Symmetry: D2
Subunit: 250 residues, 4 copies
């Protein structure tokens, strides 16, 4: 029988390429999404046409709130409902936008940025572990530039830093149960859709290895590695997939 | 004119030492507290006896909520109403208890652990900076030397502290044009809880290479004083471990 | 044309496992050795029995000296001589013994062996590899406990820290050449043969994931990943393969 | 009776500022130098005019060699000969120049860059500990950009990384003797004397805090803090003095 994986924010971009790769490797997949229903449903279609009954979608808002624990429990429950098991959780979903220190409210910014990048991954990891020959692991999508952050992205960056803490804390605490917890940290990969083309080339130009961004597929490749049987002693590790960007001084 | 500092969680232990040392250095102080009113007030009284009109208290819950931004704005405001200025912010208040992965609800634990250790520091930072829109302005965040070697089953506390490292760095960067520095002090094991059995206290003490003892609160305060001083005027984004070598010790 | 790899200190233990796995993946290999000639040759025998003329041996002392550059140049030359190309360099060879700061070999000899094997030779090999020039990369065998070092092992530890520096400096500088430079950081893997059985279990008990050491093969798996096409955007990354050991406080 | 300190490379620039501030704080000082004899004795003259018999010079090459240990022993011996004690060691002396991976032989480059930045600090630390109310400590002059290194400076950067490892290893090992071991990490401070003003300004403009370099005194201030009784629990800590430079992305 085929293992199953939850991938959050899996309708588009890196999350999508992660879901695809997991599926190609043999996994059944829960494709989580928030707003991107059309793209999510379309992906499940593609996957299931390849292998029958191997993908479902699951809608949820991962903003922090008093119901987030229930929403995260339900995402994991949805994997068990479809597939009878849940072997892999990928925390990929992420809000990303500036929150300068000097008309969404600040309480909403805090809820979205810290919810998606950190609180939801924690709650998802909690529900994953509680619901548990096997190779169980979590992969968090981190940030190679977590210590060289974007100007005015302090809440986003606080979420990402918290996610490093979670990766490590959960690696430690869940090791006795055979669950591995690891990270994959992009630098510059798929550029924001809203970003103008000049700012895009500015980012590309900073990357030592080839002066270009990572493909989504290259990011997924590192995910696939950490969930595989070639990573069975790896836990609490965060692999940069950044073409050396984090090594470049100002 | 004497400069002024807000210290959060200043009624007791490390925050108290910090407020006292800042006061001794010449600061006027806002002693923020949550539940420890009597201790906060007894410290304000002690300090006002040293120099009249140099210490006020300010009560607030720093748990994450819809009212937290207003609370933090009001803590900053309190310093201005009291003293005409706000030169130093020390983010010291912190909830600390286990939250294992496998009576409070988890959403409450999130609110308390992430709110005290991380979001309230961010909101305080915004309000501090907004009000400042040869002075020596800075923020010091109380971090954790053991942030990458966490206590078992403290994932939320640890997430909070990690987030605080990110804030320290993101704020250093963003506020540098305003001349506001932002740094941390990262204690290892300090002032152990009076109620912890001495036998449990000694298990921790025995791990510390430098003197096989915990840091005093005053030792933690000494690093804060350095960071706020004119001797640290090019230092920003730096987190100073004050840990007796504990973090260098493998399992 | 199969690609070709150099693995230093490849006669035994982790380096052996690395050469074997590389070979199984389709590489031709240079098995470098210092003292273990008999073991180097029986490995080459085994490998060339699977596939004729795909394994050669190469002897060198990697102690720092006036001749070390020439020796390192020649290790690279041997790969080009045997196989016409050099795709991968694995810096595995390492001296490891205590050098107490407060009070056999002179201190200057200790400096030479510990800093030479763990840092200077890797630098010189890196120079010669890059000079002599597809999916080219280098993988340095690091130390997950580089920041929580063994007591009285300051020279070894300085060497491994230097090797971090080299990993990152060389990733930056050789990215324009398409040469990726990465590391693999074991925590507790194969225990030193000299170690007493009870001390061995003292170390095993520290590891959260399984209370045991990584096998050499598990270390090698991370090496294989980094040299593969599935790591083509990864450079300057050091992957811990430590079972969570570096996460554990005193 | 007044404490005594050894400062390596103390004839000028940051080591001179350190010597001066230690002296102002009441230390007697050994001003080590290599080539800058005139500057060294000019400094000791000023200091001795301030308080007589409180400064001496001490010449030594800190390039790695088989006599380097004797040379480092003699530097420490010199402090005891002049002042009857040695309370503080500041490892400031450093060679700094490029060593491209693709004048001096490589053997010499290795000896100078690794000897000054790491091996001599190790040996001086051994000698300092061996010769030993008190507040004993060592401060190593590190590099805030140790993980975002200058292009083509691999040997220098290897040296500085090793120095991080020594700082940590030695803090651990010497803590039972009550000797603290810490570091101070400039980012951009006094620009190299051969730099033209234009290239100077290029480095200045990178610094968030003030778009300028740290003064020599600003670095010394962090040293004096670490040696002071205000840092009596600090060991194994490296204090960046970089105006935010290491936090700035490419
Ligand atoms: N792209 C990069 O270069 C880069 C760099 C560093 C790190 N990363 C990390 O890599 C991961 C993937 O990056 P990406 O660029 O593919 O991500 P992205 O496109 O910015 O976000 C991926 C998905 O997150 C979901 N999401 C946003 N807010 C949410 C909410 N409140 N509740 C639930 N879901 C929400 C969105 O889902 P819907 O579309 O369904 O609403 C979105 O499609 C992220 O964690 C990111 O932080 C990426
Ligand atoms: N002690 C250590 O060994 C150690 C180790 C690593 C890091 N640190 C860090 O150093 C700092 C000081 O440590 P500590 O041991 O002195 O702290 P602590 O005694 O655990 O807590 C300090 C104060 O935090 C305040 N606080 C707690 N929850 C709060 C809430 N919801 N809202 C507002 N305030 C709240 C409390 O104020 P009231 O009493 O007024 O309710 C308390 O007295 C903390 O940031 C801690 O994380 C300490
Ligand atoms: N084993 C672990 O748990 C562990 C933990 C952390 C890091 N690592 C790292 O992973 C790597 C592999 O570890 P390992 O335990 O397999 O290594 P090891 O057995 O300690 O040594 C590997 C080989 O290094 C070679 N070597 C030693 N001194 C040399 C010299 N002066 N010149 C040339 N070669 C020399 C020896 O080759 P000859 O036998 O041919 O003389 C030896 O067989 C090392 O880089 C190590 O530091 C290992
Ligand atoms: N300057 C900066 O902005 C900066 C940035 C990062 C880190 N740092 C670190 O802070 C420290 C001080 O920097 P700096 O710019 O003041 O240093 P520097 O001027 O580059 O060097 C200081 C002294 O090092 C001594 N030295 C060089 N080679 C030597 C050898 N073979 N043997 C013995 N001594 C030797 C020289 O002494 P003589 O002149 O007597 O020959 C020189 O005056 C260094 O460790 C540096 O790496 C500085
Ligand atoms: N969720 C989500 N998270 C993201 N984090 C980054 C990023 C990139 C660099 C630095 Br420094 C810090 C963060 C980007 C991004 C990707 C390309 C260009 C710019 C930003 C990005 C995104 O798009 N979506
Ligand atoms: N706010 C607050 N934060 C804290 N963090 C720690 C700490 C941090 C890292 C490790 Br690893 C272990 C404990 C302690 C602590 C330290 C020693 C004994 C009991 C508690 C502590 C505390 O008391 N109040
Ligand atoms: N070359 C070589 N390098 C080594 N480094 C470590 C090591 C492990 C832990 C800490 Br902390 C620091 C160093 C070991 C080792 C392996 C197993 C047990 C103990 C030490 C080891 C070895 O054998 N050969
Ligand atoms: N011994 C000595 N060591 C040094 N290290 C740095 C430095 C600074 C930044 C990066 Br990135 C890497 C290294 C400089 C320097 C100082 C100012 C401008 C440029 C370089 C410098 C020096 O001068 N003398």
């Amino acid at each position: 029988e085929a293992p199953a994986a939850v991938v959050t924010g899996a309708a588009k971009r890196i999350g999508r390429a992660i879901a695809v790769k997991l599926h190609q490797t043999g996994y059944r997949v829960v494709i989580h999404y928030h707003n991107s229903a059309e793209a999510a449903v379309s992906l499940a279609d593609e996957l299931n046409k390849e292998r029958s009954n191997t993908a479902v979608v699951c809608q949820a808002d991962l903003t922090n709130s008093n119901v987030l624990p229930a929403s995260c429990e339900e995402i994991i429950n949805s994997c068990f409902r479809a597939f009878g098991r849940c072997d892999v959780l990928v925390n990929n979903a992420s809000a990303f936008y500036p929150t300068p220190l000097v008309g969404k409210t600040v309480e909403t910014q805090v809820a979205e940025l810290i919810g998606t990048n950190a609180i939801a991954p924690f709650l998802l990891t909690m529900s994953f572990a509680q619901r548990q020959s096997s190779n169980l692991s979590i992969v968090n999508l981190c940030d190679a530039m977590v210590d060289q952050p974007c100007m005015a992205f302090s809440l986003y960056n606080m979420g990402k830093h918290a996610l490093v803490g979670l990766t490590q804390s959960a690696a430690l605490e869940l090791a006795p149960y055979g669950i591995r917890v690891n990270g994959v940290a992009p630098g510059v990969s798929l550029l924001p859709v809203a970003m103008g083309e000049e700012e895009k080339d500015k980012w590309r130009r900073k990357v030592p290895l080839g002066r270009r961004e990572a493909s989504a597929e290259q990011i997924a490749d590192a995910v696939i590695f950490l969930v595989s049987g070639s990573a069975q002693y790896i836990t609490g590790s965060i692999i940069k997939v950044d073409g050396g960007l984090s090594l470049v001084h100002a």
